[PDB]
Design a protein around this ligand. Structure first.
Ligand SMILES: C[C@@H](O)CC(=O)N(c1ccc(C(C)(C)C)cc1)[C@@H](C(=O)NC1CCCCC1)c1cccnc1
Ligand SMILES: C[C@@H](O)CC(=O)N(c1ccc(C(C)(C)C)cc1)[C@@H](C(=O)NC1CCCCC1)c1cccnc1
Lengths: 305, 305
């Protein structure tokens, strides 16, 4: 029993973290096979942050201008290239600790673990969701750039996020491992606004099922609703519209608990319209939306890796 | 910026997890040097759970009755002994992945990371506090027994918790790595009550400092208070009494923020007496007490390992 924001075991990713230095700027890189991946803004100076021309700045850099350090050993950089917003540094040694891996571009509302690093060394690990507005609410200090987000399936690490920047609002923005930003953000020090941050409705429902599984059920009500009726409520409260795909994804939890998805929607509707009256659900006084239906099944079934 | 419940990187502990089977019971063990540590109730059957005589049950077990498996390789058990509530299985191979480690018995209110495991394989990692009543509110399913809790200081793993049981209330109980339970709990299937679960006052204050550091400050009030006056409020709300030791431990955060500790106590007093009026602090609608002053400084300073 019990329900916690649980990250994946981070060891397979720890063995891939390296330090990348270019000039006076150091950040984190990801060493898989003989390629080190890192944010291209490693080539930026104080001058460059406001409006960098990355192609022009890159041209002034040769292989020997990138120092890559794994622990205390120095990798030899034998090639470099820019792919969208990431740099790919070819090194002369394949990482002996390279796990089975894939690069994946995740959908908004999906979750992943972040291994926060500084100077190529791991600091901690925590679970995140890609917000509907393509930000993440992480914990990142100066130098955390190039830390990665990932999921693990048995023995395979799916890398889905590289950290690039903090917005002036204090939320975080970054790329997939092909260097394409999630959302409309760009890697320059300019004012950038995130859009409206809506709540991931299918995730809240999954967490309500997790609560029922754990015995927390004061919120189960006497009503049902319809998809269209519920979504009238979701829109007023900045919740993502619920679709039949979402209902289908909740199927396994619905079957485990015997609670029809639309019945749980009606409970959520009453929760949105009346609040929680000073009660808690799974130790929280807010409706939590950073657990997917898969996350719930994993933690309530004990899937290992 | 940002503040998250952050666990330590778990790789050094992943390399120490093994599977221990005795008869039909399998759980997790911890393999350090040539010793495997695990809960002694691995020797229990269905019969034994209500009132086991562990000494008598142990006598019926020889070295070859313990199967220890690390990944898919079998360790040879060349000795066994009971130390309080843990079994120590001497194996013929020292773990090549043994990290620098220590066994530590932590104080109530201190935090640690838990690497939840099943069948010797890691499932996830999360941050926990040892409650004042010596329970932990974890996420543990059947078979999680022998999963460990730990802190890391640079290169040294301090093991402080081994999971043994779930109470009928759904909270969790376990031992240090010498097999002494935290709290009054025993390893048998009998009704066991935790006492009153009080709030870790010094941890709430630390988290309030984390909020100020992060720009969340609507709760800073115009009052101050005294230690004795504040503690009158703490007692009404089941908060741990605050001591001058606690004030001293908060010194670094007080100096970083320029907010005297007793001023923050007065803000907390108003928060306890008036609630949060539907506002949030660091994304929470409750007062969070599972961050120590050290945890806050680490996450707000970027200490790596
Ligand atoms: C240094 C780099 O290795 C990693 C790094 O930490 N940061 C970073 C610094 C410059 C850049 C440029 C692309 C502008 C060059 C990109 C990221 C800062 C950061 O984003 N500051 C923002 C702040 C408001 C807008 C301007 C930049 C940071 C701090 C905390 C968490 N995450 C990130
Ligand atoms: C099987 C063992 O390897 C690990 C294990 O998972 N559990 C365990 C089972 C028996 C025992 C005895 C000491 C009684 C033999 C100790 C622990 C159960 C558990 O505690 N059930 C409680 C339930 C109410 C009171 C009776 C025992 C569990 C489930 C979920 C989380 N944590 C633990």
């Amino acid at each position: 029993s019990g329900f916690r924001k649980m990250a994946f075991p981070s060891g397979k990713v720890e063995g891939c973290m390296v330090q990348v230095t270019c000039g006076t700027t150091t950040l984190n890189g990801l060493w898989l096979d003989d390629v080190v991946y890192c944010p291209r803004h490693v080539i930026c100076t104080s001058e460059d942050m406001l409006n960098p021309n990355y192609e022009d700045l890159l041209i002034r850099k040769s292989n020997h201008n990138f120092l890559v350090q794994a622990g205390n050993v120095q990798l030899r950089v034998i090639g470099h290239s820019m792919q969208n917003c990431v740099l790919k540094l070819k090194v002369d040694t394949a990482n002996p600790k390279t796990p089975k891996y894939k690069f994946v571009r995740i959908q908004p509302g999906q979750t992943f673990s972040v291994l926060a690093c500084y100077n190529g060394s791991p600091s901690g690990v925590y679970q995140c969701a890609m917000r509907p507005n393509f930000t993440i609410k992480g914990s990142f200090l100066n130098g955390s750039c190039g830390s990665v987000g990932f999921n693990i399936d048995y023995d395979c690490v799916s890398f889905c996020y590289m950290h690039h920047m903090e917005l002036p609002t204090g939320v975080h923005a970054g790329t997939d491992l092909e260097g394409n930003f999630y959302g409309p953000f760009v890697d320059r020090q300019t004012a950038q606004a995130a859009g409206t941050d809506t709540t991931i409705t299918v995730n809240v429902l999954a967490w309500l099922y997790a609560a029922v599984i754990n015995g927390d059920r004061w919120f189960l009500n006497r009503f049902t609703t319809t998809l269209n009726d519920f979504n009238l409520v979701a829109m007023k409260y900045n919740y993502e519209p619920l679709t039949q795909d979402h209902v289908d994804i909740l199927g396994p939890l619905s079957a485990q608990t015997g609670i029809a998805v639309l019945d749980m929607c009606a409970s959520l509707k009453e929760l949105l319209q009346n609040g929680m009256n000073g009660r808690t659900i799974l130790g929280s006084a807010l409706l939590e939306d950073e657990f997917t239906p898969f996350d719930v099944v994993r933690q309530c079934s004990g899937v290992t890796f």
